[PDB]
Amino acid sequence: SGFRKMAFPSGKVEGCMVQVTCGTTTLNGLWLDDVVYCPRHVICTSEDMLNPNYEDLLIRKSNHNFLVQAGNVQLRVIGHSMQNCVLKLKVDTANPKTPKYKFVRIQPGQTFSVLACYNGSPSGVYQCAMRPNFTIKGSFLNGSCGSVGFNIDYDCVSFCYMHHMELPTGVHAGTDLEGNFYGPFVDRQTAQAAGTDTTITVNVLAWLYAAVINGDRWFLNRFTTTLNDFNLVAMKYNYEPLTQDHVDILGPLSAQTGIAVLDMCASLKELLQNGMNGRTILGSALLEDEFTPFDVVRQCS
């Protein structure tokens, strides 16, 4: 028993992390096979940060303008291209530590592990979720760009996030590993703001199911709700709409606990109305929304 913010073991990703330098900019890259992936803004100058033309900046680079260090060894760059907002540097050595891997673009509400890195070296690992407004609430300092987010469900690393920017509210934006930003953000320092964030309702319900699996029932009640009525109430607390897809996804947890999904929805409605009245759920005094239904099954069974 127990329930923790549990990341994937980071070793398979640690072996891929390198340092990339161009000009006076140093950040992290991801060395997979003979390709190093990193944010294209490594080629930005101090005067290129508002309206860089990355095509024009890149055509002026030679392979030797990119310094790539893997531990104490310099990797020789033998080619480069850009794919959306990511730079792909061909190197003359395939990484002998490359794990089985794929690139996946995730949807809001999905969770993943982040390996925060500086100068190509890992500093720590933590769990994150893609927020409904397409930001992530990470923990990142200067030099952390190029750090990646990933899952490792079945010995295969699924890379889903690479870190590019910090908005003034202290939250973070980045791309998938094909270089497409999550959300409407651009890799320019022009003023940008995330939409109002909302709570990931299906994840809160998954976590309430985890609480019952771990033996806690105090928040249940004798009521049910229609899906329509639940959504009318929940949206008044800035919760995301719950879809029939979400209801279907919660079927397994509902089956394991004997609590119908719409009965859990009635419990959540009352929790929003009442608060926790000095109690806690799974060690929290708030409704946690960064555990997916899949995460709960992974950790509780």
Add this chain to the structure above:
Amino acid sequence: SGFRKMAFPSGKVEGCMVQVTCGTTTLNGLWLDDVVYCPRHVICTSEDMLNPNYEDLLIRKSNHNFLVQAGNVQLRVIGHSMQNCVLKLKVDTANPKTPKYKFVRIQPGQTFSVLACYNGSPSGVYQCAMRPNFTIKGSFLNGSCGSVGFNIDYDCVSFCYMHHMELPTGVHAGTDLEGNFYGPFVDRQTAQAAGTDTTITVNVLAWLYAAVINGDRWFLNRFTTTLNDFNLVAMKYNYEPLTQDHVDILGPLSAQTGIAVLDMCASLKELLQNGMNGRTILGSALLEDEFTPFDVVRQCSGVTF
């Protein structure tokens, strides 16, 4: 910016995890140099559960009674011995992925990363604190015994915890890597309970400093307190006493934020007496106590390993 419950990168420890089987019991072992460490109760039967005589149970075992698998490779056990509550299996091959390491016993209030493993395979990593009552609030399922906890200093892994058991409240107990239990627990299935827990005051203060560094300031006030006066409040609310050592350790954070410890203590006292009045701090509605002062410095300054 931002602040997360952050574990150490686990790669150095993943390469040490193996599966150990004796009879019908399978659990995890830690393979370092030419020794595999695991809980001594791996030699227990379903009828040795309650009142085992480990000295007696171990004499009947031969090296081949212990099946050690590292991935798909079976390691040949060439000797065995027991140190306190841990079994040491000497194998004929040194682990080529052995990192720089040492065994360290931690103190209550100190934090560490847990690598949860099943069948010798690492499955997840998370950060824990050793509670004042010497339990840890882990997340563990069947087959997780022998999972380990660790810190990293400067490329040196400090192993501090091995998982042994789950108590009826769902919290967990284990040993250091020399087989000494943390807390008043024994490795047999007799009735046992965790004592009343308390809150790690110095860690709460560290986390309040992290909040201030991240722009959360609503709880600051003009007041200061004395160590004596605060500890009277601390005792009243089941908080651990604050010592001068704790004040000294928070010194860096006091200087960096401009809030003296006893200044922050007045903030904490008010939070205890009044609560948080509907507000949150760093995304929590509770006073968080599983970040040490060093954890806050490490995360907010970007230390790497």
